[PDB]
Design a protein around this ligand. Structure first.
Ligand SMILES: CCCCCCCC/C=C\CCCCCCCC(=O)OC[C@H](COP(=O)(O)OCCN)OC(=O)CCCCCCC/C=C\CCCCCCCC
Ligand SMILES: CN(C)[C@H]1CCCC[C@@H]1Nc1ccc(S(=O)(=O)NC(=O)c2cc(Cl)c(OCC3CCCC3)cc2F)c(F)c1
Ligand SMILES: CC(C)CCC[C@@H](C)[C@H]1CC[C@H]2[C@@H]3CC=C4C[C@@H](OC(=O)CCC(=O)O)CC[C@]4(C)[C@H]3CC[C@]12C
Ligand SMILES: CC(=O)N[C@@H]1[C@@H](O)[C@H](O)[C@@H](CO)O[C@H]1O
Ligand SMILES: *[C@@H]1O[C@H](CO)[C@@H](O)[C@H](O)[C@H]1NC(C)=O
Ligand SMILES: *[C@@H]1O[C@H](CO)[C@@H](O)[C@H](O)[C@H]1NC(C)=O
Ligand SMILES: *[C@@H]1O[C@H](CO)[C@@H](O)[C@H](O)[C@H]1NC(C)=O
Lengths: 1113, 45
């Protein structure tokens, strides 16, 4: 018995039998269930019970140290078997049987490293979880205080004076106002527009008043700051940057532009800091695991090569030149060129095989690749094999050194990459099965709840759609799917989607980033002028002049013509600045001389500005209007003084040393996106046309089968704005896909696509999703995440150089040096208690029980803050005010007792000072709360935020939270410098966009509230765009060139037409500079400091160790 | 000469056609018809 069980258990045949059974079981869960599926589930359950019986008879149950349930693997298997039998005996529970598939992770070699890294990351995220909860709660309370009911603001028609509704009575007015038919809504809109009486907020049309407390909240009532739970969901959504432009715009439209400040904080503190902490934790976990893994342990002449290289480049260019709606000459050229290229390739292969003996020729890998290409070409011209043509592009890898090194690096460490990708796809499969089971029927049962009773494009109806929705959540979009799920489902949708976001986005994708980081990483005059140039006052004066004039330049808005005084100031400043630039250039030329002036880049910038201003001045003298683009070049003088700010040198040094690597990665990405864009052109070129009516609505294929029927019924045969008609369009659409902005429409048109000149049909071509999935793996998860890795490495080196550390020292030596330097500065201190009564108070105060009681009181006060909600009675508000009064009194008693006990020693500790400040603020608040509210509601709400001060004491006493906050405080100066660089870049782009797109007509994201008319609105848009959020709408607005009227110079009309080329340049440059370079800098900084802290607390000494030493001493 | 939506090689296309209620000029264009494959047809400019 026992002998048989042991002998059978450890044979690999049994393990592989069970693994094959599990894989078959997965394949059967993918397919819909029938009677066959029922019998096969019984078969599978029988196999699993045989396994469990064998294992238990082999080992035991729990008693032994090596019993059956001593390993979590057996725990998972046994629990799933119990759940399967429970489902058989007696629905939501039967989904989790899919968890058995987790065992399949062991098939791939090298899985132990990835599994251990994942487990270490999860176990290390505990303290980050505590800090995340606290910070999210604080922000949710602030948002509840700021935006309570603001998202319910609606434009209501005035009570009619004609008397059709009747003689006015208060009841009659309420009855009229409450009717939904009297709320303003543009036709075809699904949500009511928000309004607000604050300056800069959404205005109501004439005859409409902005009221509060009517109707429901946006998005089926799921997007509001009405309660602490909803505020928490909104804060988490904002932190994750998930569709956050919508909430951002709703809040700023209801409350006013100044509330942007709020979003600045949460975005900076929540996105640029914590998610980077999670990334740092994952990086450390993977690095520890990899460290442990490592520790454990004619035709053959260069001219011919160049000829074939140029032929390959020409072939790639011709393949890229293919597009939709060509002329006959062009494609005749292209096909003839393809025939010539195939002929050249055949000649190359034959000449090589003859010159170099056949046995050796096929030995080389590149030769066999060439031969495969030749075979595919001969088959292609023999006879779809024309897809295989794409392989030719990869031939260029032999000749491009950087691309060759990239591919060699990828081939070196394929095992880890395949393990991570397999884990990602296995987790996606598990989540897709679970979602399909939990939410499968609700989408069909409750279709009516959807806006048109029609099934949404993203659902859980079948396995394919479940996988697509889960993959979309893993990409970062989970809030909208959760909205639909809640509409048809229940609360269970929230934990699911949110969970999918943690496991996939914040753990798995961060782990992929960690892999990428680990693997891819006359004498008088000259004398006076030199003296005046080196002088400090002169340099400060020049900087001040530049900054003042640059700031003035931001006042040139759409209202400038209506301010004659501002126009005069602008003109006179232009003339004075021309004179000033000429004088400064002359002074610098006398000071440094021609040679050094014209070999420096900064003096090139100054000279270019001088030339532009002289050109503008000679134009004004000649009577020609000044070119505005040229006079906008003076802002570029702000970069030299900016680089001289304290501590800014590290950031700029990092950026200048990272430019070459970033350029190389951009080239490699252009190559891979060229491959994908050629494929996209060949797949979707000319297939995005569709029939639309007077209203821009697609028609059924039953009524319009194609373009002929479309035009016979006097309809429009309209093309989609984003398409794959040629390579440039494919580039732009793939950029939309990789950034995850505008991708939904592209895939919808892609999967409805049919033959050319045919009406698209909903989901007739579902499997085209595959095309995008691959791209997102190889164009977004890999190429776009190299920038952050490059920045991390270069910033680590730059900070090492900045602090004077030698490049040759190893990490242990650096840690020892840091410990020694810490030991250099340390001093003891002692306090003295009283007099007997004072000494008794002292003994009471010092006791840790007092601190824990205060801890509890702070927690209760925080909860009382959470209890506040919109729509609560005035009685409830008074009761909550009185509870807060009690808490304030208790904390004031704390301060009195501690002051009495510690005399002047109270102020030695910084946290005592924080508590004292908070208590004084709360007392003044008790004095002023009655007065302030009576004498704008916004002022009272904003001043009541100091209430949050006395719950911020909750962080005091924590150890891990203190560790993270110390890491954040060491990095504060660098983070501020990065933010200042970001704001200067935003200022430059704001002025230029004000010049370019100040008159475009309202379209897409651009409207009355959000546009480039003023500097403030431009800054709002640019802050939103710095995260790449919602740039598809901005692009559609600023690149529009249809139904636009040109300017009339004689009549003075400036126009309302956009520029597609200018829009592309502006937006792509902004996305590359901010989203891919400057924003990533944050992460770099964070990681370094966090790592520096963690290795101090793990393999070194920390300030807390010295603190304990001196408390003892 | 031949009509709209018919194979042609740039020298045999009718000047104009009364198709969908307007006299529309015709040029022999060449439209996507697969991977690196296109069918050359007479369509209006
Ligand atoms: C900080 C600086 C604030 C500057 C605000 C400028 C105000 C100017 C203005 O026009 O007010 C806008 C407006 C009111 O406009 P109305 O008067 O209604 O308009 C009527 C029609 N004209 O004011 C606001 O709403 C300002 C909003 C500012 C929000 C700031 C939030 C930032 C987050 C703060 C967190 C604080 C936490 C405290 C922790 C404790 C510290 C110990
Ligand atoms: C007896 N009677 C004192 C109470 C009942 C009658 C009406 C008045 C009062 N009602 C009450 C309202 C709100 C809060 S509360 O809890 O919402 N607000 C705060 O405690 C709080 C409020 C403010 Cl304005 C504040 O000022 C900011 C400082 C910053 C610099 C100088 C001003 C500070 C505060 F702590 C509160 F407890 C009490
Ligand atoms: C140094 C770095 C780290 C921080 C930079 C400070 C920003 C938070 C400042 C700089 C410019 C400021 C903006 C300047 C102009 C405006 C317009 C202002 O609204 C108005 O113009 C009110 C008048 C109206 O709307 O009618 C709203 C605040 C806002 C967006 C400001 C919000 C705060 C901003 C972004
Ligand atoms: C002016 C014009 O275009 N008239 C046509 C009409 O000849 C045709 O019968 C109808 C088909 O519904 O479409 C319209
Ligand atoms: C709103 O007004 C319309 C117009 O008379 C009326 O038919 C409708 O009943 C009103 N709504 C309610 C809830 O009474
Ligand atoms: C657009 O919609 C309106 C109302 O929904 C309807 O008359 C028609 O579908 C379109 N308008 C016109 C004038 O045809
Ligand atoms: C276009 O549709 C009309 C309407 O039925 C039909 O008479 C005509 O033959 C069609 N032409 C083509 C080329 O399909």
């Amino acid at each position: 018995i026992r002998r048989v069980a042991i002998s059978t258990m450890v044979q690999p045949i049994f393990s592989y039998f069970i693994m094959i059974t599990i894989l078959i079981h997965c394949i059967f869960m993918i397919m819909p269930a029938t009677q066959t599926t029922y019998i096969l589930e019984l078969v599978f359950l029988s196999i699993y019970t045989i396994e469990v019986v064998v294992k238990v008879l082999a080992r035991g149950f729990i008693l032994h140290p090596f019993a059956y349930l001593r390993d979590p693997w057996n725990w998972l298997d046994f629990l799933v078997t119990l759940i399967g039998y429970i489902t058989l005996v007696v629905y939501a529970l039967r989904a989790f049987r899919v968890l058995r598939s987790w065992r399949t992770v062991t098939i791939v070699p090298g899985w132990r490293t990835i599994v251990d890294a994942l487990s270490l990351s999860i176990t290390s995220l505990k303290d980050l979880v505590l800090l995340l909860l606290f910070s999210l709660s604080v922000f949710a309370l602030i948002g509840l205080q700021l935006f309570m009911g603001n998202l319910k603001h609606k434009c209501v028609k005035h009570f009619p004076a004609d008397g059709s509704w009747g003689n006015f009575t208060d009841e009659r007015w309420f009855n009229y106002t409450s009717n939904s038919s009297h709320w303003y809504i543009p036709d075809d809109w699904i949500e009511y527009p928000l309004c607000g009486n604050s300056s800069g907020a959404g205005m109501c049309p004439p005859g409409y008043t902005c009221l509060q407390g009517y109707g429901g909240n946006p998005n089926y009532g799921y997007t509001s700051f009405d309660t602490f739970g909803w505020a928490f969901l909104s804060v988490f959504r904002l932190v994750t940057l998930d569709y956050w432009e919508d909430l951002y715009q709703l809040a700023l439209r209801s409350a006013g532009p100044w509330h942007i400040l709020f979003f600045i904080i949460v975005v900076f503190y929540g996105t640029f800091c914590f998610l980077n902490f999670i990334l740092a934790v994952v990086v450390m976990s993977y690095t520890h695991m990899v460290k442990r893994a490592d520790e454990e342990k004619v035709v053959l002449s260069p001219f011919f090569e160049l000829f074939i290289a140029v032929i390959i480049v020409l072939n790639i260019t011709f393949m890229a030149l293919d597009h939709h709606d060509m002329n006959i000459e062009f494609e005749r050229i292209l096909r003839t060129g393809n025939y010539i290229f195939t002929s050249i390739y055949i000649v190359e292969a034959v000449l090589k095989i003859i010159a170099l003996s056949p046995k050796f020729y096929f030995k080389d890998s590149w030769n066999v690749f060439d031969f495969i290409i030749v075979v595919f070409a001969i088959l292609e011209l023999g006879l779809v094999f024309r897809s295989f043509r794409l392989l030719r592009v990869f031939r260029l890898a032999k000749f491009w050194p950087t691309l060759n090194n990239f591919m060699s690096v990828m081939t070196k460490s394929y095992g880890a990459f395949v393990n991570v990708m397999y884990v990602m796809f296995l987790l996606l499969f598990i989540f897709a099965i679970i979602g399909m089971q939990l939410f499968g029927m609700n989408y069909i049962d409750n279709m009516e709840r959807f806006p048109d009773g029609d099934l949404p494009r993203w659902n859980f109806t079948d396995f394919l759609h479940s996988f697509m929705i889960v993959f979309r959540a893993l990409c970062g979009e989970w809030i909208e799917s959760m909205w639909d799920c809640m509409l048809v489902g229940d609360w269970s949708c929230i934990p699911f989607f949110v969970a999918v976001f943690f496991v996939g986005n914040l753990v798995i994708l961060n782990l992929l980033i960690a892999l990428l980081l680990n693997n891819y990483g006359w004498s008088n005059i000259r004398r006076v002028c030199f003296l005046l140039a080196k002088n400090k006052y002169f340099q400060k004066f020049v900087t001040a002049v530049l900054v003042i004039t640059s700031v003035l330049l931001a006042l040139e808005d759409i209202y400038l013509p209506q301010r004659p005084v501002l126009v005069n100031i602008t003109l006179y400043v232009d003339y004075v600045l021309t004179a000033f630039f000429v004088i400064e250039m002359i002074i610098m030329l006398f000071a440094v001389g021609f040679k050094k002036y014209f070999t420096s880049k900064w003096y090139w910038l100054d000279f270019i500005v001088v030339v532009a201003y002289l050109l503008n001045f000679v134009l004004m003298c000649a009577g020609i209007e000044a070119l505005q683009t040229l006079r906008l070049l003076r802002v570029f003088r702000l970069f030299r003084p900016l680089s001289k700010v304290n501590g800014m040198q590290v950031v700029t040094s990092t950026l200048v040393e990272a430019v070459p690597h970033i350029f190389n990665v951009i080239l490699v990405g252009i190559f891979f996106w060229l491959v994908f864009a050629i494929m996209g052109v060949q797949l979707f070129a000319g297939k995005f046309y569709k029939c639309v009516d007077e209203n821009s609505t697609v028609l059924s294929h039953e009524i319009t089968m194609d373009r002929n029927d479309c035009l016979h019924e006097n309809y429009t045969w309209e093309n989609s704005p984003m398409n794959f008609d040629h390579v440039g369009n494919a580039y732009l659409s793939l950029l939309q896909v990789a950034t995850f902005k505008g991708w939904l429409q592209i895939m919808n048109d892609a999967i409805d696509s049919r033959e050319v000149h045919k009406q698209p049909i909903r989901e007739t071509n579902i499997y085209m999703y595959l095309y995008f999935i691959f791209f997102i793996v190889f164009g977004s998860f890999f190429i776009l995440k190299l920038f952050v890795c490059i920045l991390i490495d270069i910033f680590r080196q730059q900070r090492r150089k900045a602090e004077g550390l030698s490049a040759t020292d190893s990490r242990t030596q650096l840690i020892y040096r840091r410990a020694v330097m810490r030991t250099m500065s340390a001093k003891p201190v002692k306090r003295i208690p009283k007099n007997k009564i004072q000494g008794c108070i002292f003994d009471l105060v010092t006791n840790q029980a007092f601190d824990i009681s205060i801890m509890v009181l702070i927690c209760l006060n925080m909860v009382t803050m959470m209890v506040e909600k919109e729509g609560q009675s005035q009685h409830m508000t008074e009761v909550l005010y009185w509870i807060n009064v009690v808490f304030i009194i208790l904390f004031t008693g704390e301060c009195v007792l501690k002051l009495i006990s510690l005399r002047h020693y109270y102020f030695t500790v910084g946290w005592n000072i924080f508590d004292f400040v908070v208590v004084i603020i709360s007392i003044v608040g008790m004095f002023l709360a009655d007065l302030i509210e009576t004498y704008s509601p916004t002022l009272f709400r904003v001043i009541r935020l100091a209430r949050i001060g006395r719950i911020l004491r909750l962080v005091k006493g924590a150890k891990g939270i203190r560790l993270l906050l110390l890491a954040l405080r060491k990095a504060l100066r660098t983070l501020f410098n990065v933010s200042f660089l970001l704001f200067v870049i935003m200022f430059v782009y704001a002025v230029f966009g004000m010049e370019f797109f100040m008159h475009i007509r309202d379209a897409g994201a651009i409207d009355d509230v959000y546009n480039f008319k003023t500097f403030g609105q431009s800054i709002i848009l640019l802050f939103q765009l710095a995260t790449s959020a919602g740039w598809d709408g901005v692009y559609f607005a600023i690149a529009n060139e249809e139904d636009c009227r040109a300017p009339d110079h004689e009549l003075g009309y400036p126009g309302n037409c956009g520029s597609r080329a200018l829009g592309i340049a502006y937006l792509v440059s902004y996305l590359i500079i901010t989203c891919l370079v400057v924003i990533n800098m944050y992460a770099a900084v964070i990681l370094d400091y966090v790592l520096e802290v963690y290795e101090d607390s793990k393999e070194g000494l920390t300030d807390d160790d010295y603190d304990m030493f001196f408390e003892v001493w | 000469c031949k009509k709209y939506d018919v194979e042609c090689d740039s020298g045999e296309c009718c000047q104009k056609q009364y198709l969908w209620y307007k006299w529309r000029p015709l040029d022999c264009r060449c439209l996507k018809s697969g991977f690196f494959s296109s069918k050359c047809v007479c369509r209006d400019v």
